[PDB]
Curated annotation (Swiss-Prot), chain A:
The chain holds residues 33 to 215 of 220 of the full protein. Keywords: DNA-binding, Repressor, Transcription, Transcription regulation. The lineage of its organism: Bacteria, Bacillati, Actinomycetota, Actinomycetes, Mycobacteriales. GO terms for biological process: regulation of DNA-templated transcription. Residues 27-46 bind DNA. This is HTH-type transcriptional repressor KstR. One of its GO terms (molecular function) is DNA-binding transcription factor activity. Transmembrane segments: none annotated. Controls the expression of genes used for utilizing diverse lipids as energy sources. Residues 4-64 form the HTH tetR-type domain. The keyword DNA-binding applies. Homodimer.
Length: 183, 181
């Protein structure tokens, strides 16, 4: 529980710093200072700012997940239920632009050294989207569909990040993808 | 003869990228290889992103202009065939693929028009394969979904989070999910 509380402070600090200042603000020293941990302690659990940011996003997904029971996702059809989940996440993104910037940059820099962290996020977000579609245990294809929606999301955040697309554009792409996959 | 200078510039871009990746695509090197003055180069194509994006657009225009019906009896088969041929070409050209993936990652507002034109062209080619002809709105949209999956997966390959076989698999899954017979 001493490891767990230290991790909690570190990810809390990451989220606060990113939401306040974007990717450039998330410096390892700044995070360790805010979290009241020694820097080495920080590096041992999270060797770079990518690992911090992706781990923090994973934690947010699991908080979202845990409050999201089967009945909480509104909709009679898979289409309705997925659209509702996507819509909620889309609005959360639009409400938190600096955080979105920090996470998007973290993803562009994520490499093999962060594969475990990226994989846990991917597993989590795909499970959320797949369980939203499914009435019981999801099918292989519902997992695959989740992965497609997640790739459309990332590629369009790439365009947003470099100032070639707006929020109108990203939402538009997501809503098309969902409809084309399961409308 | 502007179109000759252009041809030589884009030829040099593709040759340099194919052999040496993104890092080899430098304005002086491309200028020298293309036998143009670097200033002439900087007038037509202000950065390496512009060079790489324009060179890609040219390849797809050539594929378009040299393409008859595309093999397959349904939209799925025709798109599966086309995606397959492009995958094989990616696999045989990893350095070129690296150059292009970096170009798109780094492309910003100053190359937005070039990027948009190339998108319209590549997606129309996907959609035309689906349609074996003039495509529906939906077919153009599907093409864009496939192009977004492709770029995301290329980011993962470039960063060693995915293999070339992974990218190929993900693209096949996307095709089947969107238009599968």
């Amino acid at each position: 529980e001493a490891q767990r509380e230290r991790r909690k402070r570190i990810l809390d600090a990451t989220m606060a710093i990113a939401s306040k200042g974007g990717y450039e603000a998330v410096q390892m020293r700044a995070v360790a200072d805010r979290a009241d941990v020694a820097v080495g302690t920080l590096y041992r659990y999270f060797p770079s700012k990518v690992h911090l940011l992706v781990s923090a996003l994973g934690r947010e997904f699991s908080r979202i997940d845990a409050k999201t029971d089967r009945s909480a996702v509104a909709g009679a059809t898979p289409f309705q239920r997925l659209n509702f989940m996507v819509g909620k996440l889309n609005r959360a993104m639009q409400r938190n632009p600096l955080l979105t910037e920090a996470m998007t940059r973290a993803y562009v820099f994520a490499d093999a050294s962060a594969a475990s962290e990226v994989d846990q996020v991917e597993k989590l977000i795909d499970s959320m989207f797949a369980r939203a579609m499914a009435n019981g245990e999801p099918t292989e294809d519902q997992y695959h569909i989740a992965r497609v929606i997640s790739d459309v999301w990332l590629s369009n955040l790439l365009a947003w990040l470099t100032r070639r697309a707006s929020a109108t554009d990203v939402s538009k792409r997501l809503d098309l993808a969902v409809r084309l996959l399961i409308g």
